[PDB]
Amino acid sequence: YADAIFTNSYRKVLGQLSA
Amino acid sequence: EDQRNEEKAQREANKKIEKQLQKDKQVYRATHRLLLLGAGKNTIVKQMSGIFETKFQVDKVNFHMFDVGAQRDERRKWIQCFNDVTAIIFVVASSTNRLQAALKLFDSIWNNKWLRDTSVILFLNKQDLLAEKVLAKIEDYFPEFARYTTPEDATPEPGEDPRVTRAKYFIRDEFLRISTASGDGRHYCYPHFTCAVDTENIRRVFNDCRDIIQRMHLRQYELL
Amino acid sequence: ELDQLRQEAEQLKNQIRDARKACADATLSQITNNIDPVGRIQMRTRRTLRGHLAKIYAMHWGTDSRLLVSASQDGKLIIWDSYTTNKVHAIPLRSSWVMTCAYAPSGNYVACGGLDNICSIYNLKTREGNVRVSRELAGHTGYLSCCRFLDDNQIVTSSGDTTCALWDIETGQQTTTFTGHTGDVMSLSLAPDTRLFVSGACDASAKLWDVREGMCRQTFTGHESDINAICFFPNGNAFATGSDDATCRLFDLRADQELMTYSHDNIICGITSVSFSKSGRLLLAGYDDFNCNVWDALKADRAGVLAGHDNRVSCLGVTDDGMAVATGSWDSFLKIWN
Amino acid sequence: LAEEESYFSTVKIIYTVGHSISIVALFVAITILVALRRLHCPRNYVHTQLFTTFILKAGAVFLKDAALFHSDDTDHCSFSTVLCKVSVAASHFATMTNFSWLLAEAVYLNCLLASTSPSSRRAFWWLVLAGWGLPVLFTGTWVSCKLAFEDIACWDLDDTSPYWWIIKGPIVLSVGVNFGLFLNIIRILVRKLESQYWRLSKSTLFLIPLFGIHYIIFNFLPDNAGLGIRLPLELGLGSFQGFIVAILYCFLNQEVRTEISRKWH
Amino acid sequence: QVQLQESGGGLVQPGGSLRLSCAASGFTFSNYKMNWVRQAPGKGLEWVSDISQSGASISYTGSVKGRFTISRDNAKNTLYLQMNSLKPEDTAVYYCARCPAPFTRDCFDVTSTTYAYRGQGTQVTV
Amino acid sequence: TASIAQARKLVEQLKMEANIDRIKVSKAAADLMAYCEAHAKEDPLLTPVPASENPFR
């Protein structure tokens, strides 16, 4: 659902950025 | 001192009355009130001292039927008592031009500013007993009948001649002219052909009272 | 023959009209032009009573100026303590279609009736603690439109038959049948001294009836339409009438004529109740457009508006101490104003 | 990638500002529907409850970002803090309550229409019970099965079978049954309206925001498919959806207009 | 008082033409719709024609449509009912009748033997 | 027709009511004004009393 899929996509994108 | 005792006693009496009134509210809300108003009352009652009361139920739904007897012909003051019935059940005989008098009574019922928001369930009664019209006087009192064909959307029951499928549908068209020309969204008119023998009219009363309540709720949600 | 009586009736009618015109030596609006205007009368909705299930059709204050009866087409009379909002009794009615209520000068008995053609006299002070119908006055041939107690023993009742009756409640029989109205006698008000009353009917006439003689004393004829409401001026020498013509009118019994017309051009709605403040100076009229308007009875000029009803004001009543105005409406609430 | 971040900044800006518009219009809507005694009826109670669930959804989303410490001075990899855990649980509770009360509206309307009698007093309190308690029960079950059994990494990037379907399941069910009951109400309206198709079209378009119907077109897709059109729709319009519902069901409700006008006078 | 007085010829040949007029007094004529009613010998009252406040909305009983023509003169509180081709069945007392309430669209005025707000009638005989 | 009895009651009523005496409207107005002026002090609607006797207390 909207919020949980935003948490998933956003925090994977921030994780990718961190590397 | 006695002021506290009096206040307590009064509040206990109030609590009893609150309990009774709250209990009766559900019974009042569940019971549909119906005004029965004749311009063939026996045919439309036997099959289902002042004001007269018939109390019955269909499918455990309480219906309360009120027939305004022993009141003089001047309806304008008492009929306003019935702005909060679910339907005005208008029984007109097919049958002075009693059709015209019935129709003007219905027009006055429809347009009256207090009786808006009350729907009409219109039982054209006696559609056998006089509307058989086998004569070798609808044509006389309503000369526009000569120009009216039986409608394409006619759905007859056999054993009624085309003379009857002309007559009854023309009368229905007259009442629906009165209905459609001066009412939208707030009150509805449900025509029903019916006969001295044709029973289960009570089922159609139930079905159209249900339709009225459904339309009320859809009206409140602003969906229609 | 009949045409001869028609002509004689018209001759007497023109006699009465000419006599009234000759005796209209002054006009009320001119006699009281210099009286100080009342300014503005902003009345507070000091209590709202929320008991009834359906549209309230009548209410009446007791002589104690504290308790009121209210009658609604849910078939409940409710007796309210206006000082506390507490319901003292609620009474089931055998017919839900009540149209009038009244509450005796003693407070012992409450009356109600409607399309049942019956006046029901309830005893509120019986020792058994229940409330039971003491009598059902049933000789009316049409709906009861108004009821007003003269004493615990006698009740005048008004009908949708063209007649009123003076009932003796113990006998159960109508001791006089005031007859001569030509339409429904919608409304009834007793004189402050209970030897006369005036009844207002759906023939644009109001008639003053002698309770002891039964004759019709005077016919007042100025209205254009059905008189829905009538109230004595607290002097006993004038009364006011409300009509579907969107006017109130003040009639004086001894002038035999209409002294004032209360109307405003933006009022198209009919009047449903009329009552006077204890001085008489304010005329309070209830209207179909869910408002009440307060009128200077001696100026024919507005003074205030009782707003905040959702639907037709059905009943209006001023306390005998003058302290508060009740206004019942088809919104099922009584609102008490002060 | 840097280019992606602009996409997510834009959508989370919408997610903030649109929910702000929603909460600001809707708090007014609630104060209207509760202050004005005429409007106290079961219908407006169900509406007011739904509106409260929209402020819960907005506020819990904001609290989720507030718990998501965003200075980037802490790496979100291997993260752990109590505030984040509770705020995610709250965001789930809020979304579950919103979806529950969209279904509560769907059920109240179909109960009113299907009822052969005018009363529905029991149905209202049953729908209040389900509308809040089932979100309570499901999100409490998710809190239990995480914190007491799988309290790993603040539950944030999960996509695994064990308990994500505890929340996903009710959402999917609720959107499905809303779609069915909405086509039911369309069926009833179509029979009611026998040249006037505009009224039917308007009623459909007015029901769509209230019954959560726009979720149906993505409700049954698998996650990680359709995101590029799912997320702009659900986030962008949903951020305004409380404001759309507040307009259509408080401000344009003619009873509310009349009551405000009488208060204005 | 509210007063209505009709006029119009007591006797006429079949196929003749006639005009009724009613003088209204004591009410704001422009506010009330006016009706004509008739009473044939030994029968109840029946509605003949009606006219709205302005004279816009007009209708007739079917045996009368086109044979009569209704009009109202708001300047002189006068109601008219024109008659053409009067048939034997039109032999009746004709009563002028006023709606009971101003500005309303409804009426309840055919009521036999009792009604205020309705005149004494003029005979027509064929 | 029995309507002669109704017209006879009407004419008898009008004959009775014609022979009531009538005062002039000026005296009626003086009566109403002299009543209102005397009792105007005793009208809680015209000149309201705060926090003394109201149903609010």
Residue numbers in the entry:
A (entry chain P): 1 to 19
B (entry chain A): 10 to 48, 52 to 60, 205 to 251, 263 to 303, 307 to 394
C (entry chain B): 3 to 340
D (entry chain R): 55 to 248, 258 to 328
E (entry chain N): 1 to 126
F (entry chain Y): 6 to 62
Please give the exact wording used by the authors of the publication that reports this structure.
Among the four splice variants (SVs), SV1 possesses the greatest similarity to the full-length GHRHR and remains functional by eliciting cAMP signaling and mitogenic activity upon GHRH stimulation. Compared with GHRHR, SV1 lacks a portion of the extracellular domain (ECD) because the first three exons are replaced by a fragment of intron 3, leading to the replacement of the first 89 amino acids of GHRHR with a distinct 25-amino acid sequence.
The structures of GHRH–SV1–Gs and SV1–Gs (apo) complexes were determined by single-particle cryo-EM at global resolutions of 3.3 and 2.6 Å, respectively. In the GHRH–SV1–Gs complex structure, the bundle of seven transmembrane helices adopts highly similar conformations to that of the GHRH–GHRHR–Gs complex with a Cα root-mean-square deviation of 0.5 Å. In the GHRH–SV1–Gs complex, its ECD does not stabilize the binding by GHRH, while that of GHRHR has rich interactions with GHRH involving residues L34ECD, L62ECD, F82ECD, and F85ECD. Notably, without stable interactions with residues in the SV1 ECD, the C terminus of GHRH is highly flexible. Consequently, the resolvable region of GHRH in the GHRH–SV1–Gs complex is 10 residues shorter at the C terminus than that in the GHRH–GHRHR–Gs complex. Nevertheless, due to resembling TMD conformations, the N terminus of GHRH binds to the orthosteric pocket of SV1 with an orientation similar to that in the GHRH–GHRHR–Gs complex. The GHRH–SV1–Gs complex structure shows that GHRH binds to SV1 through a continuous interacting network involving TMD helices (TMs 1 to 4 and TM7). Meanwhile, binding of GHRH yields to an extended helical conformation of TM1 and inward movements of ECLs 1 and 2 to the peptide-binding pocket of SV1.
